Design an enzyme around this catalytic site. Structure first.
Site, mmCIF file in Angstrom:
data_model
loop_
_atom_site.group_PDB
_atom_site.id
_atom_site.type_symbol
_atom_site.label_atom_id
_atom_site.label_comp_id
_atom_site.label_asym_id
_atom_site.label_seq_id
_atom_site.Cartn_x
_atom_site.Cartn_y
_atom_site.Cartn_z
ATOM 1 N N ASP A 77 -60.344 15.530 -26.157
ATOM 2 C CA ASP A 77 -58.982 14.902 -27.006
ATOM 3 C C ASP A 77 -59.534 15.194 -28.462
ATOM 4 O OD1 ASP A 77 -57.578 12.326 -28.326
ATOM 5 O OD2 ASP A 77 -56.810 12.550 -26.039
ATOM 6 N N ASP A 79 -50.938 -1.264 -31.834
ATOM 7 C CA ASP A 79 -50.586 -0.128 -31.092
ATOM 8 C C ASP A 79 -50.882 -0.269 -29.723
ATOM 9 O OD1 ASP A 79 -50.125 1.363 -33.467
ATOM 10 O OD2 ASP A 79 -52.085 2.341 -33.623
ATOM 11 N N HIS A 116 -60.094 5.168 -25.083
ATOM 12 C CA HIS A 116 -60.421 3.991 -26.235
ATOM 13 C C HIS A 116 -60.612 2.665 -25.592
ATOM 14 C CE1 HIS A 116 -59.756 7.179 -29.005
ATOM 15 N NE2 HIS A 116 -58.306 7.327 -28.752
ATOM 16 N N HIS A 132 -58.848 12.779 -30.612
ATOM 17 C CA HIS A 132 -59.645 11.582 -31.036
ATOM 18 C C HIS A 132 -61.043 11.426 -30.291
ATOM 19 C CE1 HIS A 132 -55.360 10.818 -31.603
ATOM 20 N NE2 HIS A 132 -55.863 10.211 -32.893
ATOM 21 N N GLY A 188 -55.787 2.156 -28.944
ATOM 22 C CA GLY A 188 -55.278 3.485 -29.122
ATOM 23 C C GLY A 188 -54.378 3.716 -27.693
ATOM 24 N N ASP A 245 -53.615 16.647 -27.575
ATOM 25 C CA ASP A 245 -53.402 16.434 -29.060
ATOM 26 C C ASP A 245 -53.901 17.272 -29.864
ATOM 27 O OD1 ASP A 245 -55.432 14.842 -28.263
ATOM 28 O OD2 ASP A 245 -54.421 12.871 -29.245
#
Ligand SMILES: [K+]
Ligand SMILES: [K+]
Ligand SMILES: [Zn+2]
Length: 405
Positions: free
Chosen positions: A177, A100, A142, A179, A150, A272
């Protein structure tokens, strides 16, 4: 009174140079421009350095020398169009510069540009040039000391907060976020001066898996040493709407502001959580009469604390632009007291085509209903806040705080 925003020609090119985020930054800044907000905003130029040694000194305030070296070498290899040697594959693998977080020709310059933006934004708050600074090219929560994660390569957030605390300085970090803000949480795990608060989805096998009950019965970790109780987390089940997310975080934000009395707030505003993000987990909107994002930013700005607003996640580029345009307009209204009227029709501009087929500012979603778990988390968070206040000998009206909840 002054609202800063980070942009510049090179900065734009670099922020638009990654395979994962493509031209999202261009859509964001061009929708802001299309709605005539740029004259209300102070351009904060990205930080540049007097030498490579100075740039390295700045980045290795958080990241390891060997990680920065590996990241720079990854860019060089992707530029020479050299196939990686087996030895180079192992090196990149050791830093998670793979899967990723792949290499690409601009990976180092792209990653660094975020740091340049968020460091300049922090400096502009420190010298009081601006009361709020926005960086829609930052928010890469991240990235760890020696690990890409990420699609975050360098932690512009950690380096910005380090500049603020180095400038008794306290920083409240708020991560909106989808996440968990694991990288920012970890960097400040041991500091009582930087309190981190992440609200996020957590579920089995969902990235990154932290910010919730963990096996070490599972325990809720919250920092260590002088930093004990300084790491706050609200994990939420999928499907939450604007009102419930707002009611979930509102009392936590107000209680952290009251107890901490922060010198600076740093907000990660990853988009997101929108109902239209391809993640399709939360059902937040950009609506304004109410968007959970806009409720949160309006509450944070009401504290009148110097505030850094960063981007992050957001994989529906037009809906990300739609949200961050409203956050920018809200920021101008709240800080400058100047009402900014934004037409519900997307104005004609470079990227007008990308807002089809409706070409409206409101995201194309009709909210419905998503409480028990939130109440349990509220009791646990109020408890943790008391323990944080006690450990650091902080004075606060316990009852006033209790009443927020
Ligand atoms: K978060
Ligand atoms: K902390
Ligand atoms: Zn995210």
């Amino acid at each position: 009174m002054s609202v800063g925003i980070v942009y510049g020609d090179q900065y734009r090119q670099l922020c638009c140079s990654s395979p994962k985020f493509g031209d999202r930054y261009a859509l964001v800044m061009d929708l802001i421009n299309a709605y005539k907000l740029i004259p209300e905003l102070s351009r904060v130029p990205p930080l540049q350095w007097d030498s490579p040694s100075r740039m390295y000194e700045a980045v290795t305030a958080f990241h390891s020398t060997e990680y920065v070296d590996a990241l720079k070498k990854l860019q060089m290899l992707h530029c020479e169009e050299k196939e990686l040697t087996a030895d180079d594959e192992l090196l990149m693998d050791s830093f998670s510069l793979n899967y990723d977080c792949p290499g690409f020709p601009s990976v180092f310059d792209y990653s660094l540009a975020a740091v340049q933006g968020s460091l300049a934004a922090a400096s502009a708050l420190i010298c009081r040039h601006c009361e709020v600074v926005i960086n829609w090219g930052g928010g890469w929560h991240h990235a760890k000391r020696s690990e890409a994660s990420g699609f975050c390569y360098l932690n512009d957030i950690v380096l910005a907060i380090h500049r603020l605390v180095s400038s008794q300085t306290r920083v409240l970090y708020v991560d909106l976020d989808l996440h968990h803000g694991d990288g920012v949480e970890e960097a400040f795990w041991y500091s009582p001066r930087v309190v981190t608060f992440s609200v996020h989805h957590a579920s089995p096998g969902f990235f990154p898996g932290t910010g919730t009950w963990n096996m070490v019965l599972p325990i809720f970790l919250n920092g260590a040493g002088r930093g004990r109780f300084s790491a706050f987390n609200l994990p939420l089940e999928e499907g939450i709407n604007d009102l419930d997310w707002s009611n979930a975080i509102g009392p936590i934000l107000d209680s952290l502001n009251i107890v901490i009395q922060p010198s600076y707030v740093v907000v990660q505003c990853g988009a997101d959580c929108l109902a239209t993000d391809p993640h399709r987990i939360f059902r937040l909107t950009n609506f304004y009469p109410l968007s959970g994002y806009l409720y949160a930013i309006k509450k944070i700005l009401s504290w009148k604390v110097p505030t850094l607003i960063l981007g992050g996640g957001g994989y529906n580029f037009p809906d990300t632009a739609r949200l961050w345009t409203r956050v920018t307009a809200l920021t101008i209204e709240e800080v400058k007291g100047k009402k900014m009227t934004i037409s519900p029709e997307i104005p004609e501009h470079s990227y007008f085509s990308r807002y089809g087929p409706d070409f409206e500012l409101d995201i194309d979603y009709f909210p419905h209903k998503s409480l028990d778990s939130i109440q349990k988390h509220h009791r646990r968070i109020l408890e943790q806040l008391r323990n944080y206040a006690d450990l650091n000998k902080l004075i606060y009206d316990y009852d006033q705080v209790y009443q927020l909840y």
